[PDB]
Write a protein that binds this DNA or RNA. Structure first.
Ligand SMILES: Nc1nc2c(ncn2[C@H]2C[C@H](O)[C@@H](COP(=O)(O)NP(=O)(O)OP(=O)(O)O)O2)c(=O)[nH]1
Ligand SMILES: [Mg+2]
Ligand SMILES: [Mg+2]
Length: 430
DNA sequence: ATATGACGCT
DNA sequence: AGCGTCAT
């Protein structure tokens, strides 16, 4: 009871850029701003595949993984920016560089864990602590939180969004107790003040807008972030969890969006996160494993312990290209030439990485997919990465996969390869 | 014909 | 080491 863990020790935030690749292209091309527009890869087959969609375009039903030609049917004025194509493949350098702009600003405020090209978690516990004494028991004005939503408020005894937002924020602040600086709700509030600052600095110094979640762990902060996208941040308190989880589909929680989430729903016969609280931890472990059972028992009560790992840089550097359908590679000459094209991009990203970040990869993973296989990878092999030489890396990669060719004729390659993937890993300081 | 990054299991 | 899962 007095020994009941509530998982309120940390203040964690998740910051995620709004339609990130679109904003990168809209900063560069002012004609795309404030318009329905999308970012697409390639062009020939059906206009290219969309990977990012402005909010103006989303209102017409344009989505990620839509073909651009089909998107034009939903939204005929849709504007398109195409990903740079280098050596016959996608080249994401502009967005990787834009991403570093954002990560470097966020890193001024606290320890960040890079979670993707466009989002990072941040552990605000320390900054909240020190910011709490410098404030010296002085109230927190609603002016310090001009874009914050308090999840679950307003409640109890306007028709417009901004009015609802301020009303819930007012109720939250009014009930706030400067409670020996130990109140978890006060800590979250101060955390939300800092995230307003971080988000203002990102937008001032890059032009990019973002959303954020603020809570006590990573799962709740990431969930919170998406509740009021775009250009807003959301505070999810410990006390908001029972109502929030009571109608929250299980698949919306990070790591439950795939097979494990489906077997939770199937084996237990439930739909929503809160229904997990009925079961004992042993029950959950017996269904889902000791690790998963423990994680689910705490998570459905809003408790989660994955730490914000101090990592601002990716741990692997990789490039890949799919060869779908008729384009599947069928000759040894084709396979060799695309391993070279991949190896050449990889070399120039590794070389820039070593200069920027004082490290060298030591392992090259080669990964191929053969025609007629539903998996991301059909086969994965490794070799030593001793030199950043594109010809050496592609030739080495060919060596470790060449035995996979079950072709009697020497020039041909069967079964045809529908994917090549080169990934550099196992870094050491340089 | 929906590039590429982190991590668990064995 | 190699394969499977989950995600943006
Ligand atoms: N090459 C490639 N890039 C992708 C893919 N999916 C996403 N991206 C790229 C493009 C994305 O812009 C970027 C970040 O992914 P999100 O945060 O999930 N979506 P966004 O930031 O656009 O919108 P909002 O966050 O407001 O919902 O990663 C993909 O399948 N392939
Ligand atoms: Mg985003
Ligand atoms: Mg994201």
């Amino acid at each position: 009871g007095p020994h009941m863990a509530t998982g309120q020790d940390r203040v964690v935030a998740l910051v995620d850029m709004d339609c990130f690749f679109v904003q990168v292209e809209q900063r560069q091309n002012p004609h795309l701003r404030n318009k329905p527009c999308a970012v697409v890869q390639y062009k020939s087959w059906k206009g290219g595949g969309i990977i990012a969609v402005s909010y103006e375009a989303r209102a017409f039903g344009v989505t990620r993984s839509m073909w651009a030609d089909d998107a034009k049917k939903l939204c005929p004025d849709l504007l398109l920016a195409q990903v740079r194509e280098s050596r016959g493949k996608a080249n994401l350098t502009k967005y990787r560089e834009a991403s570093v702009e954002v990560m470097e600003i966020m890193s001024r405020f606290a320890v960040i864990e890079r979670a993707s090209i466009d989002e990072a978690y941040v552990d605000l516990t320390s900054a909240v602590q020190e910011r709490l004494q410098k404030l010296q028991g002085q109230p927190i004005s609603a002016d310090l939180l001009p874009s914050t939503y308090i999840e679950g408020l307003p409640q109890g005894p306007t028709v417009q969004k901004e009015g609802m937002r301020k009303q819930g924020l007012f109720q939250w602040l009014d009930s706030l107790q400067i409670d020996n600086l130990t109140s978890p709700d006060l800590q979250l509030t101060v955390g939300a003040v800092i995230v307003e600052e971080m988000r203002a600095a990102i937008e001032r110094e890059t032009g990019f807008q973002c959303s954020a979640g603020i809570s006590h762990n990573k799962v709740l902060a990431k969930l919170a972030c998406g509740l009021n996208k775009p250009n807003r941040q959301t505070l999810v308190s410990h006390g908001s969890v029972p109502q929030l989880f009571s109608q929250m589909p299980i698949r919306k929680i990070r790591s439950l969006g795939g097979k494990l989430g489906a077997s939770v729903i199937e084996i237990l016969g439930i739909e929503y996160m809160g229904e997990l609280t009925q079961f004992t931890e042993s029950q959950l472990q017996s269904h889902f494993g000791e690790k998963n059972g423990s994680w689910l028992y705490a998570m459905c009560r809003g408790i989660e312990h994955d730490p914000v790992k101090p990592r601002q840089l990716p741990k692997t550097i990789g490039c890949s290209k799919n060869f779908p359908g008729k384009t599947a590679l069928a000759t040894r000459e084709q396979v060799q030439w695309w391993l070279l094209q991949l190896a050449q991009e990889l070399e120039e990203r590794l070389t820039k990485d070593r200069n920027d970040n004082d490290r060298v990869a030591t392992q090259l993973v080669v990964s191929i997919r053969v025609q007629g296989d539903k998996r991301l990878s059909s086969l994965r092999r490794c070799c030593a990465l001793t030199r950043y030489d594109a010809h050496k890396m592609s030739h080495d990669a060919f060596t470790v996969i060449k035995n996979c060719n079950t072709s009697g004729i020497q020039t041909e390659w069967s079964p045809p390869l529908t994917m090549l993937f080169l990934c550099a890993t196992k870094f050491s300081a340089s």
